Structures are given as structure tokens and as C-alpha cells.
Curated annotation (Swiss-Prot), chain A:
The lineage of its organism: Eukaryota, Fungi, Dikarya, Ascomycota, Saccharomycotina. Keywords: Golgi apparatus. Gene3D superfamilies: 3.30.450.70. This is TRAPP-associated protein TCA17. Interacts with the TRAPP II complex; TRAPP II subunits TRS33 and TRS65 are required for this interaction.
Curated annotation (Swiss-Prot), chain B:
Component of the TRAPP I, TRAPP II and TRAPP III complexes which act as guanine nucleotide exchange factors (GEF) for YPT1. TRAPP I plays a key role in the late stages of endoplasmic reticulum to Golgi traffic. TRAPP II plays a role in intra-Golgi transport. TRAPP III plays a role in autophagosome formation. Required for sporulation. Has a role late in meiosis following DNA replication. Transmembrane segments: none annotated. Belongs to the TRAPP small subunits family. BET5 subfamily. It comes from Saccharomyces cerevisiae (strain ATCC 204508 / S288c) (Baker's yeast). It holds the Pfam family Sybindin. The keyword Endoplasmic reticulum applies. The keyword Ion transport does not apply. It is found in: Golgi apparatus, cis-Golgi network; Endoplasmic reticulum; Preautophagosomal structure. Part of the multisubunit TRAPP (transport protein particle) I complex composed of BET3, BET5, TRS20, TRS23, TRS31 and TRS33. Part of the multisubunit TRAPP (transport protein particle) II complex composed of BET3, BET5, TRS20, TRS23, TRS31, TRS33, TRS65, TRS85, TRS120 and TRS130. Part of the multisubunit TRAPP (transport protein particle) III complex composed of BET3, BET5, TRS20, TRS23, TRS31, TRS33 and TRS85. One of its GO terms (cellular component) is TRAPP complex. This is Trafficking protein particle complex subunit BET5.
Swiss-Prot record, chain C:
It comes from Saccharomyces cerevisiae (strain ATCC 204508 / S288c) (Baker's yeast). Specific subunit of the TRAPP II complex, a highly conserved vesicle tethering complex that functions in the late Golgi as a guanine nucleotide exchange factor (GEF) for the Golgi YPT1 GTPase. TRS130 plays a role in the YPT GEF activity of TRAPP II in concert with the two other TRAPP II-specific subunits TRS65 and TRS120. Required for both the cytoplasm-to-vacuole targeting (Cvt) pathway and starvation-induced autophagy through its role in ATG8 and ATG9 trafficking. It comes from the Eukaryota. The gene is TRS130. Coiled coil: none annotated. It is found in: Golgi apparatus. Part of the multisubunit TRAPP (transport protein particle) II complex composed of BET3, BET5, TRS20, TRS23, TRS31, TRS33, TRS65, TRS120 and TRS130. Interacts with YPT31 and YPT32. Present with 432 molecules/cell in log phase SD medium. The lineage of its organism: Eukaryota, Fungi, Dikarya, Ascomycota, Saccharomycotina. This is Trafficking protein particle complex II-specific subunit 130. Belongs to the TMEM1 family.
Swiss-Prot record, chain D:
It comes from Saccharomyces cerevisiae (strain ATCC 204508 / S288c) (Baker's yeast). Keywords: Acetylation, Autophagy, Endoplasmic reticulum, ER-Golgi transport, Golgi apparatus, Transport. One of its GO terms (biological process) is retrograde transport, endosome to Golgi. Component of the TRAPP I, TRAPP II and TRAPP III complexes which act as guanine nucleotide exchange factors (GEF) for YPT1. TRAPP I plays a key role in the late stages of endoplasmic reticulum to Golgi traffic. TRAPP II plays a role in intra-Golgi transport. TRAPP III plays a role in autophagosome formation. Required for sporulation. Has a role late in meiosis following DNA replication. Belongs to the TRAPP small subunits family. BET3 subfamily. The keyword Calcium does not apply. Its main location: Golgi. This is Trafficking protein particle complex subunit 33.
Length: 140, 156, 94, 207
């Protein structure tokens, strides 16, 4: 399963990283999809888990040939949004569990990069570079 | 039970003195008293000399260390560590050896309340001029004396 | 395919009937939108290579919209369903 | 899961006040590595120096040590949230849940014992009360010099303040609406007497 894009947004709606695993202007399409997905979290349309204190994955929506899932981290306010092709999904339960697993690996990478004891206080460029090289290492 | 307890360091300088009396636990405990400064240097001389004799005539590949030394009346229980810190103890016979007791003292009183006691110093010879037996900077840690007296109170 | 299509349709209609009743009960509306979203995802994902998928999908969405017609929540559900309809219309016509 | 000996960890954790004074003095016993001489200053001397140097020097050192504790808490909070996953929300449902999480988890992981009871005024400040405070259980000067003891352990009490301040950060409230202060006002009420006589109280206020 090759994700189309992975997006990380903080509590303050500031995108950390909208990396795509490289067509030139598909970055615009994926970034628009991320912007559209950002508002689903604060909406009564979708009921979040709020049960047993476990993050829950939700199929938030599908537009323009991209099934996009998202996870909310209620404790920290972090927001992960990841997209996939329709052509590469058979819609099986094991596939859903695998997607949850890839979400877990993404969260692990993000936490491990943030807890680096050389990040000065908020230097975003270093975070982007570190996460980008880690994601290149994984999605390849 | 026991009669007196002494602690020396690498620097050949007596670090602790505790002298006991008749079997009452609240004995005449003159701690770090100047009146026993005379009868500590010659005790260290005994222990160093017999340790040298032991090492000189030793065999094997272990470099043995002296365990105990008994005179006619009393006997000496000694424990020497690699860090150069000797725990000596005068006592009547009454039982085989105090190796477990001295090891417990080193591993649960000294190590806990002196080495891990960053307020207090270590290697009490400071900045030369007392590194070689000529000085007095004996420990006076409240916890050390209190816990040590509590531990040796049953045995006396 | 007769093995799984009409079975899916029958189960879906019985589910949306017995599980929720229409006409207010905004929790029922939220759950109904969840049900239709899961069903449309399920029928889109694994009936692919069916040539008449999109013709079915447009008519299904526009027919199912008819129930949500008599507050902000209902308007938002209607807007989302129209958005899915428009997106599938584009994906077919292009 | 991997483990490390608690003794060496506690030794490192105590070794911040000597750091805090020594680094500040470096900004403001001769010894050789291989070819170049480096000055090494004994750890216990620096606590004496911090006691008896200056008010502004002391304030700078305490702020530095608070920053160290802040970094520790800030980094630790994310891993605790990932592992234990408490039932907290981002900014504020109620401060009682946040402080309960801190008491139940952070002190369990850092120190070997759960922190004891805590007061609650229900509108403003919270008091966290800790008895016998593990990392100074073997800290003493002299039989008579008892008043010096309290005044000269005071810099050691900043790292948990920094930890609490950091844990509060990255969990909603930042380090402008939160003020925290440690003190020795606690009594050994009725528990068995340990080595150290005085307890620890963390007066933390948020708004």
C-alpha cells in the first residue's frame, strides 16, 4: 500500500509537512485535499471515537479519486491525514488494520523526530528536513 | 559485641572514629575525638604493615587481602576495598567473622550517605598538604552517624 | 452479479429502515449519513471493473438525497451528499 | 522493554546544580586530557559556591536549571501520552484531570513512588505534596548546621518544578499563564521519619 500523500497539522491549524512520495501539479491537488480535510475534525457530522482512550481511524471522505483517512490525537491536538488510490485498495479488513499500522508508524516517526534533543526550540526547517528524509527511508 | 570502629581512606588519613564502653548502648561515644588521634595512626601502621607482609609472601594470581587479626584479648576485623577505603573494627571474639557486617556497612551506610551525598566531600584530603596522613577532615554527616549508631546498637 | 449485489441492496435498505427512523432525531440523521457513506465507499471500492458503476452511482446519490428534504446539520449533510454527487459526475464525464 | 540502573540515573539527575553553577561560571584542579589542560572543579564545592555567591547569580542559575527541567518535562510528556494514553483533552476540561495524570504517571516514571495527596481550591492554585522526596534522601551537612540545610538544598528543588511546568506545556496552557514554586513548608505529619526531615510542596497556579 503506497499512500498518495501524508499531511501533519498541529493544534493551531499550521501544516508541518504535506510530503508527497514523488506529475508536477498533483502537489496542488493533494494540498487542496488536505485543506478540505482539515475542518472535518471540529464537526458534528462525524462522531469521533471518545471510547476506551484509543486513537481511532476514520474514512473521513473521498474526493477526486483519493480515499483519505485521518486520525485525531485528542491529547496533543495533532492531526494526521493520509490518502490512497482506489486502484490499490481491495477494501478488506486486514487492509484497514494495515492502514492503521502505517498511521502508527507515521505517528512514531513524528514523535521520535520531535523529541530529538538538538531541535533548538521551534526551527521548522529542521523538522521538515528530518521528517522528509525519514519518510523517504520508509516509503521506498 | 564490639569496642571501636575506624575508617581510613586511600590517603592514609583516619576518616571516622567511634569508641564504645560497657554494654549499655548509649555508651561514651566520643566521635572523632582528638584524644584517640594517637591510637589510630599506629593501628593504621599495624594494618598496613601486616597487609604488606601478606602481599609479599602471597601466591597464586589473586593478591589476597587480610581478613582478621586476633591478639590475646581482642581481635581486629578488617575489610579493604579496591578504592582504598579500609573498614576496621575492634571486638571480642564471640563469633567467627564480621565480613558480612562490614560489607553491609560499606554498601548501605557509607555508599548511601557519603558517596551519594554531594553536599559532603569525598577524598577528604583537599589540595595537597594533607594527602599523606597529616590532617583531620573527619565526616560529621548527621545521617551517617545516626544510621551507623542505630545499626551497631544491637551488637555491643 | 447476482451473488452479492442484491444481497447488499437488501441488507442496506433493511438497515437504514430498522436502524434509524427519519423525520428529526438529529442523531439518527448523523448515523444515516454514516451508513450511506460506508455503503457508497463499500460499493465503489470492490465493484470496480464494473462498467456501469458511475451511472449507478449518480442515480443512487440523487435518489438517496430525496429523503433529506422537508437546521445547520441537515444542510451540511445535504451539502456533503451533493459534493459527492458532483465529484462522481466529474469523474464520469471527464 | 529496555532498562537502566536507577542508581546511575539518580546520580545524573542530582548532577544538575553543579552543572548549573559551573556552566554559568564558565560563561562569566588543573588536568590534562591528552595534550591540552582543562580545569576541573569539584562538584561539592559548587553547591557551597551557589549558596554564597550572589542574588542575581543565584537567580540566573535557578532559571537555567528550571529550563533544564522544562526541557525534560516537555520531551517526556509526548512519550507518556503515546504510551499510557490518558483521558485528557488538549486545552482544558478541568485542571484536576491534568494534575491527576501528572501525579499518577509522571512521578511514577521519574521517581520510584507515586506522589502523595494534593490539595484543591477548585478555582485557582493546586498544591502537590510529596513526602521524603527521593532524590535528596541522602543529603546532609552537620549535626548542628540544620538551618543551613534547608537554604542550601533549595536549588535542587527546581528540576521537578521545571518538569511540572514542561508537562503543563504541550498540554494546553503555556509557560506564561502558569507559575509554580517549590518550598519546604511541609511537615512529616505522621509517617515514619526518614533520613531527610522536611517534605516538599509544589505550589502551582494556572489561569
Amino acid at each position: 500500500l503506497r499512500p498518495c500523500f501524508v499531511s501533519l497539522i498541529d493544534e493551531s491549524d499550521k501544516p508541518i509537512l504535506i510530503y508527497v512520495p514523488n506529475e508536477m501539479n498533483d502537489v496542488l491537488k493533494y494540498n487542496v485535499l488536505s485543506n478540505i480535510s482539515l475542518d472535518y475534525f471540529e464537526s458534528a457530522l462525524v462522531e469521533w471515537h471518545s471510547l476506551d482512550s484509543k486513537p481511532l481511524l476514520k474514512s473521513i471522505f473521498q474526493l477526486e479519486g483519493v480515499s483519505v483517512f485521518a486520525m485525531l490525537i485528542k491529547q496533543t491536538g495533532l492531526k494526521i491525514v493520509i490518502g490512497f488510490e482506489q486502484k490499490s485498495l481491495s477494501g478488506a479488513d486486514d487492509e484497514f488494520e494495515a492502514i492503521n499500522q502505517i498511521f502508527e508508524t507515521v505517528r512514531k516517526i513524528y514523535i521520535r523526530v520531535k523529541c530529538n534533543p538538538l531541535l533548538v526550540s521551534g526551527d521548522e526547517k529542521s523538522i521538515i528536513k528530518s521528517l522528509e528524509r525519514k519518510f523517504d527511508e520508509l516509503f521506498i | 559485641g564490639i569496642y571501636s570502629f575506624w575508617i581510613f581512606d586511600r590517603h592514609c588519613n583516619c576518616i571516622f572514629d567511634r569508641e564504645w564502653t560497657l554494654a549499655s548502648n548509649s555508651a561514651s561515644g566520643t566521635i572523632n575525638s582528638k584524644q584517640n588521634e594517637e591510637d589510630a595512626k599506629l593501628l593504621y601502621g599495624m594494618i598496613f604493615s601486616l597487609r604488606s607482609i601478606t602481599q609479599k609472601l602471597s601466591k597464586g594470581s589473586v593478591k589476597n587481602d587480610i581478613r582478621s587479626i586476633s591478639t590475646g584479648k581482642y581481635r581486629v576485623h578488617t575489610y579493604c576495598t579496591a578504592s582504598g577505603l579500609w573498614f576496621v573494627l575492634l571486638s571480642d571474639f564471640k563469633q567467627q567473622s564480621y565480613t558480612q557486617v562490614l560489607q553491609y556497612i560499606y554498601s548501605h551506610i557509607y555508599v548511601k550517605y557519603v558517596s551519594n551525598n554531594l553536599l559532603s566531600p569525598y577524598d577528604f584530603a583537599e589540595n595537597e598538604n594533607e594527602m599523606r596522613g597529616q590532617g583531620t577532615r573527619k565526616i560529621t554527616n548527621r545521617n551517617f552517624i545516626s544510621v551507623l549508631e542505630s545499626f551497631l546498637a544491637p551488637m555491643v | 452479479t447476482l451473488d452479492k449485489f442484491q444481497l447488499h441492496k437488501y441488507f442496506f435498505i433493511r438497515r437504514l429502515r430498522l436502524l434509524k427512523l427519519e423525520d428529526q432525531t438529529l442523531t439518527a440523521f448523523v448515523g444515516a449519513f454514516q451508513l450511506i457513506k460506508n455503503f457508497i465507499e463499500s460499493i465503489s471500492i470492490e465493484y470496480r471493473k464494473s462498467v456501469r458503476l458511475l451511472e449507478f452511482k449518480h442515480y443512487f446519490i440523487t435518489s438517496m438525497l430525496s429523503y433529506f428534504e422537508f437546521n445547520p446539520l441537515l444542510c451540511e449533510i445535504k451539502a456533503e451528499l451533493l459534493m459527492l454527487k458532483r465529484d462522481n459526475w466529474v469523474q464520469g464525464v471527464m | 522493554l529496555p532498562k537502566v540502573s536507577q542508581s546511575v540515573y539518580q546520580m545524573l539527575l542530582n548532577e544538575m546544580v553543579p552543572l548549573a553553577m559551573g556552566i554559568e561560571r564558565q560563561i562569566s584542579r588543573l588536568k590534562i586530557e591528552e595534550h591540552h589542560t582543562v580545569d576541573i572543579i569539584r562538584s561539592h564545592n559548587l553547591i557551597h559556591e551557589l549558596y554564597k555567591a550572589d542574588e542575581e547569580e543565584k537567580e540566573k542559575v535557578l532559571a537555567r536549571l528550571r529550563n533544564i527541567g522544562f526541557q525534560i518535562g516537555l520531551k517526556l510528556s509526548e512519550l507518556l501520552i503515546f504510551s499510557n494514553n490518558p483521558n485528557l483533552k488538549f486545552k482544558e476540561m478541568d485542571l484536576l484531570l491534568i494534575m491527576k495524570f501528572i501525579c499518577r504517571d509522571v512521578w511514577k516514571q521519574i521517581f520510584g513512588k507515586q506522589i502523595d495527596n494534593l490539595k484543591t481550591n477548585h478555582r485557582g492554585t493546586f498544591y502537590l505534596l510529596d513526602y521524603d522526596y527521593r532524590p535528596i534522601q541522602s543529603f546532609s551537612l552537620e549535626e548542628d548546621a540544620k538551618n543551613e540545610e534547608l537554604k542550601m538544598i533549595e536549588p535542587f528543588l527546581e528540576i521537578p518544578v521545571g518538569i511540572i511546568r514542561g508537562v503543563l506545556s504541550s498540554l494546553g496552557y503555556s509557560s506564561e499563564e502558569v507559575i509554580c514554586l517549590a518550598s519546604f513548608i511541609d511537615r512529616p505529619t505522621d509517617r515514619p521519619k526518614t533520613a531527610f526531615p522536611k517534605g516538599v510542596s509544589f505550589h502551582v497556579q494556572v489561569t
